[PDB]
Symmetry: D2
Subunit: 472 residues, 4 copies
């Protein structure tokens, strides 16, 4: 066929579905799948990310994606009316710097954000904390510096999904509400997709955007098991709160990224609601429910660091979702060794933000183009990337471990932190050396592996050895 | 007609249907059970565990405690009679036989130390089987050492039920006895909220925290039936990290403003943790952030650190019917009422059901319930001075239970500066009536308009009864 | 006589003694006071040459506060030549008076936003208005400090030419300079000032002796007003001075290091503050608590030692935790009841006062000494110091409303500075319940006078008999001046 | 006469001096040591007559621990007549040695369950086994205490006839009793013990003098082994004694009150503990920190003062917060490297040792003094003190595994005693990551000797050079005895 099947009905699948449907009105595009958010670019900057070449490449793509959002939103709202609600919930972001965290993360990351803004010539301003709208922190948890980032905003993800579905149907797209079980290929070319109702759908192009299940789906094809990097579940907890007085901030309020890619932010919503997020934990098997620990940490941070009024506010919903966490720390975007087989996944914290750029990239590739410059390193069929030295990762994992203390925030005898830093180094060095002679997992995954069962560690040692064998 | 489909309404519905097979009994209320206390309950069959020094210092408190001890004796046969109408696959109502009461220092000495001694004394006086045990012998618990118990009390035959399985068993038993479930609400004494009129010779109001507002519309009854407010309670269902649970109820004594910490075992790798309490002058159907954090923080530190890594399945919110004079509304009027049971209507349900059915049959029911007749002047079970001591102690207890860390001069400074404003409030509200601490704190922090409305209410009650 | 007796051997007494002795070589100047220096503020001081570092929003919101600040800036200009003139009378082995040239002010979140944020902005504004050399610097560029990350500063301010002196070396240099100028040290205390026919006759000492004098300069720190108040009518004409009891410590650092600059916060709850003053020889000074007491106290409380040490180890350097405690020091800041110093002449011919300087008499000492010596010589001394004449009705530098807002903020600041951890509703509840009792106290004390916050908190928690005695005092002052 | 020199003027030196002088009309007895009592344990002590209060599960799990406990119980019986005999040489104005008859042991949650819960049960068991008079009492019945509710005890144990002495009044009474019995106080320090032909000749003092003697008794606290170790072969034959640096304080209470009994916890992390010992005249003693140091230290650290004050104000009486700090005291508990005292004779004729008593030499003093004096007179002294002879191979009272479990528990206890507030996963993570480094250190130090936990933590955090010197020491001891 010249038929296109999109596997996955999140922001990535629907965004690629909309772009394909709008760009090839002559072809049938079918999308599979059943029934905050920050547009994070500069707010996502860390010293550690920008210290690596792969990190600077990923950041450049986030900055490119940000430029597409205003026209993208206009093109999606154009297919609806006033009563559909607004996709955009804020235009600007304030980054707050407080002392409820590690200096080695929060101080370094604040300086890195300021530098990245200046280098990109982005509009921004360091502002007086007193000039920050709405916030009412605990004085012992208050910010002493604040950074206004202009044109870095937030969307209502529910209104975005509704606008994407409406836009998909308007462009002639077909929704088939079943899951893909299997991609069929032979003679190095896609034939189509078997669905979980036993049916077969033919296609000339299959775009896999099935979140954390994307690699498991492609890895079943010959040789691909050790050629497509594994994706794990980055379980994230957020909450919808009805504010005591129905108020909200005019901007996103956030810290820089914190221990193990968690962070604190408040995204405005319409109708007296605020979104608060967000925890992150890489889990070696999926989990569908928030832990007690995750809910307490999120609520405690927001009530102390953002607004004490949230303490008396009504909890409407605890939300849980899986960030696709790629084992080498970078997304899987583009073509494979199988003609017509494409992947858009492993986007972790910022697949939603990158969605309009990733959609256009894959559509360009499908049309014989080269899409967006600088995505080549993030091709889905690859040896695991080694974006950092083992030494860099070992420094990072110990700093992030210590940051879980300072972010609590703990109160300990003053000799205890130095004692724990000293005694953490050995076990993480030993683990890294045992896992592989060539591959080192990023800190977020290394902590999950450190505290997993021996059987799960041994399975990863085997995985890493099978990848080495395949690519060397 | 029984108005209300909580434990009290269904329990009285079952007893009426089983006892008068010749009469049509219809029970009103919807599956949503808005603000429903019963589905938010663990629930503990709390008798001795509910004892406080403050309660047992009043005659009315000792009367309420005696009724709880009597109710406990009915539970085994009551459960047998409810499970008899079902099969194995309906699940078990009883979730535990025994209770361990823990004493730790994450609270006020003036509540927790006094209440532990009062529980021990009440057990000995009632000749109840119990034992002070080594904390090391308490199974399953894994507290933070800085939050750990140093004393523990095993109470034999004081257990817990699954409130959801209890409600299902009561409904099934009600239908088996020929009862009719009509899933609408009463608007007026019965006119229902679909505009219909249902005729009846008897109306039993067991509508939880809405019960007094429903009866108060009838001539003169606005100042003759004591007000009932919403004691908003937050609890949670947690799937434990390893699917384990304790063999017993684990609890503290009742704490600041009738909150408390407990874990009730459930089947299938779940535990119930509770429970916050806040008297609200208007109903609230959602947990606050503060309530969720306090509940989770207490359970993870004082009971089991493993709960920290456990999955949150459900945050539950219900309204304890909070009577303005601190005692239930049970019996006949100048029409019957079963309400204002606050923390222990579920536990007392089989006794209260049999009491009201006896009254309806021309009997005198259970001897000591006369003071708790629903049509009454507000009870004054304590002196103003006793309540002012209590409200300041409970206010300070919200600090010690957090637990806070403060400069050592601050607690005495706050005790001194709390006394005046509470004395001023009590004197302003009425020359004769004093609200119990739980309600006094809610009034202290309410709008001036809400305070003035209560001053008028108290004055209208005085005028009616004096 | 034309004899001069200086009563008191702190920085103010010795500084005025040196200036008198140097300026009137023809007269006998005798300085009273003992080596023990009981309740002595000066030996307990670091000490900071605090001008811009002492700026608060509250001080600079009052006319009297802006006047006192201008005098501190003027005093700073005298220090280099003053130190040169004092070291000149000694040799290399006497050691150096100056211990630092510059000050870093740190801003952290271990305190009330309503004090620390307001005061940091006020310091920056005062520096800009005075065209003083200064720079907001990256916290990472602050040398030596090693704070707890949860207690770390996020802003820092380098103040150039605002430094520190060793108060012990200063006192030794002043005594030596006093003797070099022909002064006589008599190590006894004054018990009584003798006056008749509106003129000083001299001083009875606590060994029973009588010393004659044409001039008596009272610089007896917190005892100064109690000494003069015995003279006819002066009990209600010289504002009361109380004890601002201050705790500091000398610490031998783990590695013998110290910072190159003063390290400090802005002034905090009830005029306490956190600072580290460099010393020679592997020692640092840490200070300093403040508590107004209605009676003198010569020993640190447990609370004061814990708070000082806890703040320094978390906010400045965790290495201080393992450092050796050499000395806990206690002195009395002379705390004037109306919040301003007592400097100049009286209705008694030849009777002068130099006191009530609270936190900054050591810094102002060379200016105050020259002012009083000018007055004694028939001059007008320094222009803005006439308002701080010792014989006066109590100053009312703030409205009752301003003081009531201040006392509640400072009370709440004692929580945030601890720092406490409380349920989030508790602070608002305590703010609400503090307002009434402080308003009631202020209204009860007097219809016209309001004590500043530092003294109002001491009175709030004093005995009923002490409150009633102050009500009588305020009524007697009103009667005398109205 | 046949001269005896006692080296050291603590409780052990003076107690042996008194017994010799009273018992031996044939000997001239001279006692060395200065009034300053540098590093002196005795003057820093409260002191508790600790027998049952000193019981821990860990001590009573070893044979050597049960032997030491039996001796403490025996020592208690001697105190009433000993005190009578010392006060007899003075008058009313000298003050009373005994300050309390009874002890209350409190159990709170400001500590590790693995120490405080185990130790409370061990104390109860030891009391019952000895048939000692005692009673578990309601906490509400404990007089005087006013703890923070979050730091309060939930169990309390009254121990009858286990009391306290004023260590200062004891030292004064011992000196006076020594002089009355014809003893000579020579206020200089020994620099060197002179011996030849396997016999003591006497002592070179730090004023350059030589004092001849037939007997030298070394009771120089933590300096005792370093003084004897210079003699041929004795460096590896007398177990090392380190400084168990202890911080205590004298506090004048806010109202001049005090408790009628000793108030204490069981022994806590690394042999620290919390106690209040009554004193006369509106004073209380609070103690006491412990830290084994490889070199002597004569000053409290900031950390030690904060921890001691914080524990006492929260766990015993909040009124201490507002009380006046009169004195911070520092002394060295003689900490033997093998965990047991050094009491009796040596391979050198006339050379005796009384040291390494750590926490309870003052309590054991009358028994230890009589033991050594009996030995000097050709007697056999007290049964069961032979195992603690000073010239010995290091004792191994516990398995390496027992000590490794103990050191990790004690390390974790430093967190719970603070008390810290941490994420709930952190303690298990720290327990896991502490095991490896302590196992590695223990294996590296020696194939045969394991230092007890108190010393192992000090070695773990010492310089590499200090660790290597101890590896050599242990190897030289092995070579000498095997
Ligand atoms: C903890 C602390 C920290 C400080 N830090 C600083 C700082 O950083 N910078 C700064 O500028 N200043 C500082 N100060 C000091 C402050 O400036 C004081 O206002 C100043 O030292 C007051 O000096 P004085 O000479 O008036 O009083 P004192 O220094 O108290 O001297 C008065 C002397 O007179 C003696 N005396 C009392 N009665 C009699 C009598 N009857 N007869 C004779 N003699 C008598 C007293 O014993 C005493 O020695 C600090 C003070 C304290 C307590
Ligand atoms: C903080 C603290 C609290 C304590 N609490 C208690 C308690 O409650 N109960 C209890 O029983 N015990 C207590 N102790 C003391 C403990 O029992 C000690 O083991 C005991 O005091 C040791 O006495 P000593 O005479 O061996 O040593 P020390 O008391 O140290 O006496 C040795 C003396 O010899 C001197 N000396 C050193 N070198 C020389 C030399 N070369 N020549 C001459 N003299 C020299 C020293 O200066 C010193 O004065 C406590 C100790 C401390 C530090
Ligand atoms: N704020 C970051 C969230 C992720 C995180 O901190 N993970 C931790 C770490 O891997 C490690 O702890 C620290 N503090 O470094 C580890 C210690 O065992 O615990 C992880 N967190 C948990 N992982 C545990 C399991 O999911 C089940 N039980 C729990 O309690 C869960 N908690």
């Amino acid at each position: 066929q010249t038929d296109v099947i999109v596997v996955g009905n999140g922001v990535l699948g629907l965004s690629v579905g909309v772009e394909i449907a709008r760009t090839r009105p002559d072809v049938r595009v079918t999308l599979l799948g059943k029934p905050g958010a920050m547009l994070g670019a500069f707010g996502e900057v860390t010293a550690h990310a920008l210290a690596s070449e792969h990190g600077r490449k990923k950041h450049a793509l986030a900055v490119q994606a940000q430029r597409l959002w205003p026209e993208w939103i206009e093109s999606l709202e154009a297919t609806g009316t006033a009563a559909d609600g607004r996709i955009k919930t804020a235009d600007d972001t304030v980054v707050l710097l407080n002392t409820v965290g590690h200096s080695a993360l929060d101080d370094a990351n604040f300086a890195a954000v300021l530098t990245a803004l200046k280098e990109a010539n982005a509009p921004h301003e360091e502002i007086a904390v007193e000039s920050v709208d709405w916030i009412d922190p605990d004085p012992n948890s208050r910010p002493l510096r604040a950074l206004h980032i202009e044109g870095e905003g937030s969307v209502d993800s529910g209104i975005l999904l509704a606008a994407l579905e409406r836009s998909f149907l308007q462009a002639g797209g077909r929704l088939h509400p079943v899951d893909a079980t299997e991609i069929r290929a032979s003679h190095g070319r896609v034939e189509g997709v078997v669905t979980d109702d036993g049916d077969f759908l033919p296609a000339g192009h299959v775009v896999v955007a099935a979140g954390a299940r994307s690699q498991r789906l492609v890895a079943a094809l010959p040789g691909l098991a050790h050629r497509i990097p594994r994706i794990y579940d980055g379980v994230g907890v957020s909450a919808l709160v009805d504010t005591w007085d129905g108020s909200g901030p005019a901007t996103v309020l956030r810290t820089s990224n914190r221990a193990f890619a968690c962070g604190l932010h408040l995204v405005p919503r319409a109708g007296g609601s605020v979104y608060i997020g967000a925890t992150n934990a890489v889990c070696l098997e999926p989990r569908g429910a928030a832990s007690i620990e995750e809910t307490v940490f999120l609520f405690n941070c927001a009530t102390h660091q953002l607004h004490r009024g949230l303490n008396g506010s009504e909890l409407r919903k605890v939300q849980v979702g899986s960030r696709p966490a790629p084992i080498d720390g970078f997304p899987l975007i583009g073509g494979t060794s199988v003609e017509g087989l494409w992947m858009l996944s492993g986007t972790y914290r910022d697949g939603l933000h990158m969605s309009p750029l990733l959609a256009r990239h894959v559509v360009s590739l499908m049309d014989g183009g080269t899409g967006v410059d600088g995505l080549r390193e993030f091709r889905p069929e690859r040896d695991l990337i080694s974006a950092w030295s083992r030494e860099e990762i070992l420094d990072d994992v110990v700093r992030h471990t210590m940051a879980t203390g300072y972010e609590f925030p703990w109160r300990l005898p003053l000799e205890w932190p130095h004692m724990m830093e000293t005694f953490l180094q050995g076990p993480f060095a030993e683990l890294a050396d045992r896992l592989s002679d060539t591959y080192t997992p990023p800190a977020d995954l290394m902590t999950a592996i450190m505290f997993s069962e021996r059987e799960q560690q041994d399975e990863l040692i085997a995985y890493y050895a099978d990848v080495h064998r395949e690519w060397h």
